[PDB]
Amino acid sequence: GLISGISIIVGTIIGSGIFVSPKSVLSNTEAVGPCLIIWAACGVLATLGALCFAELGTMITYLMEPIPAYLFSWASLIVIKPTSFAIICLSFSEYVCAPFYVGCKPPQIVVKCLAAAAILFISTVNSLNIFTAAKLVIVAIIIISGLVLLAGAISLAFYNGLWAYDGWNQLNYITEELRNPYRNLPLAIIIGIPLVTACYILMNVSYFTVMTATELLQSQAVAVTFGDRVLYPASWIVPLFVAFSTIGAAPAPAIIFYGIIATIYIIPGDINSLVNYFSFAAWLFYGLTILGLIVIPVLMTLISVFLVLAPIYLYCVLFILSGLLFYF
C-alpha cells in the first residue's frame, strides 16, 4: 500500500543523473560544504514541488493550464523531451567508453558518434524492471562502501542539482490507481522525496572521502573513477551497471520526431551545455504552473523566478518564446 507507493516514487526519481551532476555542481560552488547545501536545497525544492503537484494534479484531472498551454505543448516537443532524451544518451556514452581511456579523457568525436548510435538504436527498438533493480544496486553499493571508509554561479548549481530530481512533476499520474489519495499520495511524497535527498547526500559524501575536491573537476564520469579506487579487483561492475540502466531510462511519428531533432542537439552542445538548456525552459513553465495555482506556493514561485532571471540561454528564448508566438 503505502510502502509500494513510496517504492514507486523512489524508482521514478533516482535516475541517471546522480553520477553526472556532481562534476558540474562542484565546478560552480568550488567547495564541499556549499555543494552539499545546494544539494539539500535542490532536494527540499523538489519535495515541495512534488507536494504541490500532488494537490494541483488531483483537482483538475497541459492539463494544469490557452496561450500558456500552447507554449507548454510547443516547448515539450523540442527543448524538454528531446533535450532530456539527448542528455541521458550523452551520459550513457561518457560512461561506456570511460574505462577504455584510463589516463586521459575520451575524444569528443568518439563520444558523439557513440551517443548518436545509442539514439538511433533505442529509437528503432521503441518503434517496433531489471534496469531499476540494477540502478539501485550501484546507489546502495556506493553508499555502503562509502561508510565503511568514513567512520550567476549559484544558479547553475541548482540547474545541475535538480537534473538528478527528474520525475517529481509526473508523480500523481502514476499514483492515482493505488489507493485513496486522501492521506497517501501527499504522505508518500513528504517522506519519499526527502528519503532520496538523504540518499543523494549519503552518495555524494562517498565521493569526497575517496577522491579530493580538485579531482572531481577533471573527471567526466565520477562513478568509474570511484569504482577503481575502492573496488580495485572488481572495477568493471560500476561502469557496466550505470550504463546498462541508463540506456533503459531513455507512436511511430512521435518517436521518429523525437530521435531526429535530438541528434542535432548533441553536435553543438556538450553534456553540460544541455542541462542548463533543458532546466531553463522546464523550470520556466514550472513557475508558471505554480503561479497559475495561486491565481509552499509562496516559496515555490519566488524561488522559480530567481532560477530563471539569474542566468539572464540566448539560443533558447527564440524557440519557446518566439517559435510558437508567430504560429499562434
mmCIF file of all heavy atoms in Angstrom, residues 82-91 93 108-120 259-274 277:
data_model
loop_
_atom_site.group_PDB
_atom_site.id
_atom_site.type_symbol
_atom_site.label_atom_id
_atom_site.label_comp_id
_atom_site.label_asym_id
_atom_site.label_seq_id
_atom_site.Cartn_x
_atom_site.Cartn_y
_atom_site.Cartn_z
ATOM 1 N N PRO A 82 13.035 16.132 -26.216
ATOM 2 C CA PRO A 82 14.224 15.735 -26.993
ATOM 3 C C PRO A 82 15.533 16.098 -26.315
ATOM 4 O O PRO A 82 16.518 15.365 -26.460
ATOM 5 C CB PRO A 82 14.045 16.485 -28.322
ATOM 6 C CG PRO A 82 12.610 16.868 -28.363
ATOM 7 C CD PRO A 82 12.244 17.137 -26.946
ATOM 8 N N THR A 83 15.576 17.210 -25.580
ATOM 9 C CA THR A 83 16.809 17.600 -24.906
ATOM 10 C C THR A 83 17.140 16.641 -23.770
ATOM 11 O O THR A 83 18.284 16.191 -23.639
ATOM 12 C CB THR A 83 16.696 19.034 -24.384
ATOM 13 O OG1 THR A 83 16.310 19.903 -25.455
ATOM 14 C CG2 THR A 83 18.030 19.499 -23.820
ATOM 15 N N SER A 84 16.149 16.315 -22.938
ATOM 16 C CA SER A 84 16.371 15.337 -21.879
ATOM 17 C C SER A 84 16.654 13.952 -22.446
ATOM 18 O O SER A 84 17.330 13.145 -21.801
ATOM 19 C CB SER A 84 15.164 15.288 -20.942
ATOM 20 O OG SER A 84 14.195 14.365 -21.407
ATOM 21 N N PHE A 85 16.148 13.663 -23.647
ATOM 22 C CA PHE A 85 16.449 12.390 -24.292
ATOM 23 C C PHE A 85 17.898 12.332 -24.760
ATOM 24 O O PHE A 85 18.481 11.244 -24.836
ATOM 25 C CB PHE A 85 15.493 12.164 -25.465
ATOM 26 C CG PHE A 85 15.806 10.942 -26.279
ATOM 27 C CD1 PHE A 85 15.524 9.678 -25.791
ATOM 28 C CD2 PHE A 85 16.368 11.059 -27.538
ATOM 29 C CE1 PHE A 85 15.807 8.553 -26.540
ATOM 30 C CE2 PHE A 85 16.653 9.938 -28.293
ATOM 31 C CZ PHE A 85 16.371 8.683 -27.793
ATOM 32 N N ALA A 86 18.493 13.484 -25.075
ATOM 33 C CA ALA A 86 19.887 13.516 -25.500
ATOM 34 C C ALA A 86 20.847 13.523 -24.317
ATOM 35 O O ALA A 86 21.962 13.001 -24.431
ATOM 36 C CB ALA A 86 20.138 14.737 -26.387
ATOM 37 N N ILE A 87 20.440 14.103 -23.186
ATOM 38 C CA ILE A 87 21.306 14.128 -22.011
ATOM 39 C C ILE A 87 21.492 12.722 -21.456
ATOM 40 O O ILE A 87 22.587 12.350 -21.019
ATOM 41 C CB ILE A 87 20.735 15.086 -20.949
ATOM 42 C CG1 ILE A 87 20.683 16.515 -21.492
ATOM 43 C CG2 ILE A 87 21.570 15.040 -19.679
ATOM 44 C CD1 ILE A 87 20.108 17.515 -20.517
ATOM 45 N N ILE A 88 20.427 11.917 -21.469
ATOM 46 C CA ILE A 88 20.529 10.541 -20.994
ATOM 47 C C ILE A 88 21.452 9.733 -21.895
ATOM 48 O O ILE A 88 22.237 8.901 -21.423
ATOM 49 C CB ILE A 88 19.130 9.905 -20.897
ATOM 50 C CG1 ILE A 88 18.252 10.695 -19.925
ATOM 51 C CG2 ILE A 88 19.228 8.454 -20.457
ATOM 52 C CD1 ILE A 88 16.847 10.153 -19.794
ATOM 53 N N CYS A 89 21.384 9.971 -23.209
ATOM 54 C CA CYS A 89 22.261 9.257 -24.130
ATOM 55 C C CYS A 89 23.697 9.757 -24.040
ATOM 56 O O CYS A 89 24.634 8.970 -24.209
ATOM 57 C CB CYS A 89 21.736 9.388 -25.560
ATOM 58 S SG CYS A 89 20.488 8.158 -25.997
ATOM 59 N N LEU A 90 23.892 11.053 -23.785
ATOM 60 C CA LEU A 90 25.241 11.569 -23.587
ATOM 61 C C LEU A 90 25.851 11.027 -22.300
ATOM 62 O O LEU A 90 27.059 10.770 -22.237
ATOM 63 C CB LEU A 90 25.228 13.098 -23.573
ATOM 64 C CG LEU A 90 25.138 13.789 -24.933
ATOM 65 C CD1 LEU A 90 25.095 15.299 -24.764
ATOM 66 C CD2 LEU A 90 26.304 13.379 -25.818
ATOM 67 N N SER A 91 25.033 10.850 -21.262
ATOM 68 C CA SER A 91 25.527 10.265 -20.021
ATOM 69 C C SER A 91 25.872 8.792 -20.195
ATOM 70 O O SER A 91 26.799 8.294 -19.550
ATOM 71 C CB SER A 91 24.497 10.443 -18.907
ATOM 72 O OG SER A 91 23.963 11.756 -18.912
ATOM 73 N N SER A 93 26.960 7.519 -23.060
ATOM 74 C CA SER A 93 28.150 7.465 -23.904
ATOM 75 C C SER A 93 29.412 7.767 -23.105
ATOM 76 O O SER A 93 30.444 7.115 -23.298
ATOM 77 C CB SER A 93 28.010 8.442 -25.071
ATOM 78 O OG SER A 93 29.278 8.793 -25.594
ATOM 79 N N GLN A 108 36.182 13.854 -28.144
ATOM 80 C CA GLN A 108 34.839 14.387 -28.343
ATOM 81 C C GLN A 108 34.156 13.735 -29.536
ATOM 82 O O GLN A 108 32.927 13.613 -29.566
ATOM 83 C CB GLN A 108 34.895 15.905 -28.515
ATOM 84 C CG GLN A 108 33.681 16.633 -27.962
ATOM 85 C CD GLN A 108 33.562 16.502 -26.455
ATOM 86 O OE1 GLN A 108 32.464 16.356 -25.917
ATOM 87 N NE2 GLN A 108 34.695 16.556 -25.765
ATOM 88 N N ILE A 109 34.935 13.311 -30.534
ATOM 89 C CA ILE A 109 34.352 12.664 -31.705
ATOM 90 C C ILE A 109 33.809 11.288 -31.341
ATOM 91 O O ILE A 109 32.741 10.880 -31.812
ATOM 92 C CB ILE A 109 35.389 12.583 -32.840
ATOM 93 C CG1 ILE A 109 35.882 13.982 -33.210
ATOM 94 C CG2 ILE A 109 34.801 11.887 -34.058
ATOM 95 C CD1 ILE A 109 34.786 14.910 -33.684
ATOM 96 N N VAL A 110 34.526 10.559 -30.485
ATOM 97 C CA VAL A 110 34.127 9.194 -30.150
ATOM 98 C C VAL A 110 32.843 9.196 -29.327
ATOM 99 O O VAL A 110 31.958 8.356 -29.527
ATOM 100 C CB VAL A 110 35.267 8.468 -29.415
ATOM 101 C CG1 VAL A 110 34.853 7.049 -29.053
ATOM 102 C CG2 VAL A 110 36.525 8.460 -30.268
ATOM 103 N N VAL A 111 32.718 10.143 -28.394
ATOM 104 C CA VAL A 111 31.557 10.150 -27.511
ATOM 105 C C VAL A 111 30.307 10.626 -28.242
ATOM 106 O O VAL A 111 29.186 10.272 -27.859
ATOM 107 C CB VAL A 111 31.836 11.005 -26.260
ATOM 108 C CG1 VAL A 111 32.957 10.389 -25.437
ATOM 109 C CG2 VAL A 111 32.179 12.431 -26.651
ATOM 110 N N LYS A 112 30.466 11.431 -29.298
ATOM 111 C CA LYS A 112 29.298 11.936 -30.011
ATOM 112 C C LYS A 112 28.719 10.883 -30.948
ATOM 113 O O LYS A 112 27.499 10.682 -30.986
ATOM 114 C CB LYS A 112 29.654 13.206 -30.782
ATOM 115 C CG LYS A 112 29.904 14.414 -29.897
ATOM 116 C CD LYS A 112 28.785 14.600 -28.888
ATOM 117 C CE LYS A 112 29.112 15.705 -27.898
ATOM 118 N NZ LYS A 112 29.333 17.012 -28.573
ATOM 119 N N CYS A 113 29.573 10.204 -31.720
ATOM 120 C CA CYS A 113 29.085 9.152 -32.604
ATOM 121 C C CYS A 113 28.533 7.975 -31.808
ATOM 122 O O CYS A 113 27.585 7.312 -32.244
ATOM 123 C CB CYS A 113 30.196 8.690 -33.549
ATOM 124 S SG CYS A 113 31.110 10.024 -34.353
ATOM 125 N N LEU A 114 29.117 7.698 -30.641
ATOM 126 C CA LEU A 114 28.596 6.630 -29.796
ATOM 127 C C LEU A 114 27.261 7.023 -29.175
ATOM 128 O O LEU A 114 26.383 6.173 -28.987
ATOM 129 C CB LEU A 114 29.613 6.274 -28.712
ATOM 130 C CG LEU A 114 29.397 4.954 -27.973
ATOM 131 C CD1 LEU A 114 29.003 3.851 -28.941
ATOM 132 C CD2 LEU A 114 30.651 4.573 -27.207
ATOM 133 N N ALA A 115 27.091 8.307 -28.849
ATOM 134 C CA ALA A 115 25.806 8.774 -28.340
ATOM 135 C C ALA A 115 24.761 8.817 -29.448
ATOM 136 O O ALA A 115 23.592 8.488 -29.219
ATOM 137 C CB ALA A 115 25.961 10.149 -27.694
ATOM 138 N N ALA A 116 25.162 9.228 -30.654
ATOM 139 C CA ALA A 116 24.235 9.236 -31.780
ATOM 140 C C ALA A 116 23.820 7.820 -32.162
ATOM 141 O O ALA A 116 22.668 7.589 -32.548
ATOM 142 C CB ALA A 116 24.863 9.954 -32.973
ATOM 143 N N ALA A 117 24.744 6.864 -32.065
ATOM 144 C CA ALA A 117 24.395 5.472 -32.335
ATOM 145 C C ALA A 117 23.440 4.933 -31.279
ATOM 146 O O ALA A 117 22.572 4.105 -31.579
ATOM 147 C CB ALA A 117 25.660 4.616 -32.405
ATOM 148 N N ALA A 118 23.588 5.388 -30.033
ATOM 149 C CA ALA A 118 22.663 4.978 -28.982
ATOM 150 C C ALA A 118 21.281 5.579 -29.204
ATOM 151 O O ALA A 118 20.265 4.955 -28.875
ATOM 152 C CB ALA A 118 23.210 5.377 -27.613
ATOM 153 N N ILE A 119 21.224 6.791 -29.758
ATOM 154 C CA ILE A 119 19.938 7.425 -30.041
ATOM 155 C C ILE A 119 19.201 6.662 -31.135
ATOM 156 O O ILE A 119 18.013 6.345 -31.005
ATOM 157 C CB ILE A 119 20.139 8.903 -30.424
ATOM 158 C CG1 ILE A 119 20.504 9.731 -29.191
ATOM 159 C CG2 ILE A 119 18.894 9.458 -31.093
ATOM 160 C CD1 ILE A 119 20.690 11.203 -29.479
ATOM 161 N N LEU A 120 19.900 6.351 -32.229
ATOM 162 C CA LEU A 120 19.261 5.670 -33.351
ATOM 163 C C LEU A 120 18.857 4.247 -32.982
ATOM 164 O O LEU A 120 17.911 3.697 -33.555
ATOM 165 C CB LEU A 120 20.195 5.665 -34.561
ATOM 166 C CG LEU A 120 20.005 6.780 -35.594
ATOM 167 C CD1 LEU A 120 20.235 8.151 -34.975
ATOM 168 C CD2 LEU A 120 20.927 6.567 -36.784
ATOM 169 N N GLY A 259 13.712 11.449 -32.201
ATOM 170 C CA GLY A 259 15.046 10.928 -32.414
ATOM 171 C C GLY A 259 15.807 11.656 -33.503
ATOM 172 O O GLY A 259 17.033 11.541 -33.595
ATOM 173 N N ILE A 260 15.088 12.411 -34.334
ATOM 174 C CA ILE A 260 15.737 13.153 -35.413
ATOM 175 C C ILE A 260 16.265 14.487 -34.903
ATOM 176 O O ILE A 260 17.429 14.837 -35.132
ATOM 177 C CB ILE A 260 14.762 13.341 -36.589
ATOM 178 C CG1 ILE A 260 14.648 12.048 -37.400
ATOM 179 C CG2 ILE A 260 15.210 14.490 -37.481
ATOM 180 C CD1 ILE A 260 13.774 12.171 -38.628
ATOM 181 N N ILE A 261 15.422 15.251 -34.204
ATOM 182 C CA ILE A 261 15.847 16.550 -33.683
ATOM 183 C C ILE A 261 16.706 16.430 -32.435
ATOM 184 O O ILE A 261 17.312 17.425 -32.019
ATOM 185 C CB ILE A 261 14.635 17.451 -33.382
ATOM 186 C CG1 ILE A 261 13.850 16.917 -32.182
ATOM 187 C CG2 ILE A 261 13.738 17.562 -34.605
ATOM 188 C CD1 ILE A 261 12.606 17.718 -31.873
ATOM 189 N N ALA A 262 16.776 15.247 -31.824
ATOM 190 C CA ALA A 262 17.664 15.043 -30.689
ATOM 191 C C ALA A 262 19.103 14.793 -31.114
ATOM 192 O O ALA A 262 20.020 15.026 -30.319
ATOM 193 C CB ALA A 262 17.173 13.878 -29.829
ATOM 194 N N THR A 263 19.321 14.326 -32.345
ATOM 195 C CA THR A 263 20.681 14.126 -32.832
ATOM 196 C C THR A 263 21.371 15.452 -33.121
ATOM 197 O O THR A 263 22.588 15.571 -32.928
ATOM 198 C CB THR A 263 20.668 13.247 -34.084
ATOM 199 O OG1 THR A 263 19.890 12.070 -33.835
ATOM 200 C CG2 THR A 263 22.082 12.836 -34.467
ATOM 201 N N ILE A 264 20.617 16.461 -33.570
ATOM 202 C CA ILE A 264 21.192 17.782 -33.816
ATOM 203 C C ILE A 264 21.390 18.580 -32.540
ATOM 204 O O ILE A 264 21.885 19.713 -32.603
ATOM 205 C CB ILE A 264 20.315 18.594 -34.794
ATOM 206 C CG1 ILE A 264 19.087 19.156 -34.077
ATOM 207 C CG2 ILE A 264 19.897 17.731 -35.974
ATOM 208 C CD1 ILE A 264 18.165 19.948 -34.978
ATOM 209 N N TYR A 265 21.020 18.030 -31.385
ATOM 210 C CA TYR A 265 21.240 18.698 -30.110
ATOM 211 C C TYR A 265 22.573 18.334 -29.471
ATOM 212 O O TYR A 265 23.049 19.074 -28.602
ATOM 213 C CB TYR A 265 20.108 18.362 -29.132
ATOM 214 C CG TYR A 265 19.038 19.425 -29.041
ATOM 215 C CD1 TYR A 265 17.745 19.175 -29.481
ATOM 216 C CD2 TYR A 265 19.317 20.677 -28.508
ATOM 217 C CE1 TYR A 265 16.763 20.142 -29.399
ATOM 218 C CE2 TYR A 265 18.341 21.649 -28.423
ATOM 219 C CZ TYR A 265 17.065 21.377 -28.868
ATOM 220 O OH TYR A 265 16.089 22.342 -28.783
ATOM 221 N N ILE A 266 23.182 17.217 -29.876
ATOM 222 C CA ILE A 266 24.462 16.793 -29.313
ATOM 223 C C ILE A 266 25.650 17.251 -30.146
ATOM 224 O O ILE A 266 26.796 17.144 -29.677
ATOM 225 C CB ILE A 266 24.515 15.260 -29.136
ATOM 226 C CG1 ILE A 266 24.563 14.567 -30.498
ATOM 227 C CG2 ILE A 266 23.323 14.775 -28.329
ATOM 228 C CD1 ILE A 266 24.671 13.062 -30.413
ATOM 229 N N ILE A 267 25.425 17.756 -31.354
ATOM 230 C CA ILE A 267 26.514 18.209 -32.218
ATOM 231 C C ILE A 267 27.073 19.540 -31.714
ATOM 232 O O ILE A 267 28.293 19.640 -31.518
ATOM 233 C CB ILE A 267 26.060 18.305 -33.685
ATOM 234 C CG1 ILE A 267 25.563 16.944 -34.178
ATOM 235 C CG2 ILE A 267 27.196 18.812 -34.562
ATOM 236 C CD1 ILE A 267 25.062 16.960 -35.605
ATOM 237 N N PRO A 268 26.266 20.579 -31.488
ATOM 238 C CA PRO A 268 26.826 21.843 -30.996
ATOM 239 C C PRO A 268 26.784 22.021 -29.487
ATOM 240 O O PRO A 268 27.163 23.094 -29.003
ATOM 241 C CB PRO A 268 25.932 22.886 -31.684
ATOM 242 C CG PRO A 268 24.617 22.178 -31.929
ATOM 243 C CD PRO A 268 24.809 20.705 -31.670
ATOM 244 N N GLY A 269 26.346 21.022 -28.739
ATOM 245 C CA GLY A 269 26.255 21.135 -27.293
ATOM 246 C C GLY A 269 26.791 19.904 -26.600
ATOM 247 O O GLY A 269 26.574 18.778 -27.048
ATOM 248 N N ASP A 270 27.498 20.130 -25.496
ATOM 249 C CA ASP A 270 28.065 19.052 -24.703
ATOM 250 C C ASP A 270 27.052 18.608 -23.648
ATOM 251 O O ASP A 270 25.898 19.045 -23.640
ATOM 252 C CB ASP A 270 29.385 19.496 -24.075
ATOM 253 C CG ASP A 270 30.291 20.205 -25.062
ATOM 254 O OD1 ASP A 270 30.848 19.529 -25.952
ATOM 255 O OD2 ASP A 270 30.447 21.438 -24.947
ATOM 256 N N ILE A 271 27.477 17.728 -22.739
ATOM 257 C CA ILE A 271 26.582 17.254 -21.691
ATOM 258 C C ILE A 271 26.332 18.325 -20.639
ATOM 259 O O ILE A 271 25.355 18.237 -19.889
ATOM 260 C CB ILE A 271 27.143 15.969 -21.050
ATOM 261 C CG1 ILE A 271 26.028 15.185 -20.354
ATOM 262 C CG2 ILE A 271 28.261 16.298 -20.070
ATOM 263 C CD1 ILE A 271 26.471 13.841 -19.831
ATOM 264 N N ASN A 272 27.190 19.345 -20.566
ATOM 265 C CA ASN A 272 27.000 20.434 -19.617
ATOM 266 C C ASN A 272 26.194 21.584 -20.200
ATOM 267 O O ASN A 272 25.500 22.284 -19.455
ATOM 268 C CB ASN A 272 28.358 20.950 -19.128
ATOM 269 C CG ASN A 272 28.226 22.027 -18.071
ATOM 270 O OD1 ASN A 272 28.058 21.732 -16.886
ATOM 271 N ND2 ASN A 272 28.305 23.284 -18.492
ATOM 272 N N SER A 273 26.268 21.792 -21.513
ATOM 273 C CA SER A 273 25.525 22.858 -22.170
ATOM 274 C C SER A 273 24.069 22.495 -22.432
ATOM 275 O O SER A 273 23.312 23.348 -22.911
ATOM 276 C CB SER A 273 26.204 23.240 -23.488
ATOM 277 O OG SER A 273 25.296 23.889 -24.361
ATOM 278 N N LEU A 274 23.658 21.261 -22.133
ATOM 279 C CA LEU A 274 22.279 20.841 -22.330
ATOM 280 C C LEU A 274 21.482 20.757 -21.036
ATOM 281 O O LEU A 274 20.253 20.868 -21.078
ATOM 282 C CB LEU A 274 22.231 19.480 -23.037
ATOM 283 C CG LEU A 274 22.727 19.448 -24.483
ATOM 284 C CD1 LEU A 274 22.562 18.058 -25.076
ATOM 285 C CD2 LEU A 274 21.998 20.483 -25.325
ATOM 286 N N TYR A 277 20.281 24.069 -20.461
ATOM 287 C CA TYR A 277 19.369 24.385 -21.551
ATOM 288 C C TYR A 277 17.996 23.754 -21.371
ATOM 289 O O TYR A 277 16.995 24.346 -21.792
ATOM 290 C CB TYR A 277 19.965 23.925 -22.888
ATOM 291 C CG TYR A 277 19.109 24.235 -24.096
ATOM 292 C CD1 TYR A 277 19.189 25.467 -24.729
ATOM 293 C CD2 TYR A 277 18.231 23.289 -24.611
ATOM 294 C CE1 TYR A 277 18.411 25.753 -25.835
ATOM 295 C CE2 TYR A 277 17.448 23.567 -25.715
ATOM 296 C CZ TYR A 277 17.543 24.800 -26.323
ATOM 297 O OH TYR A 277 16.768 25.081 -27.425
#
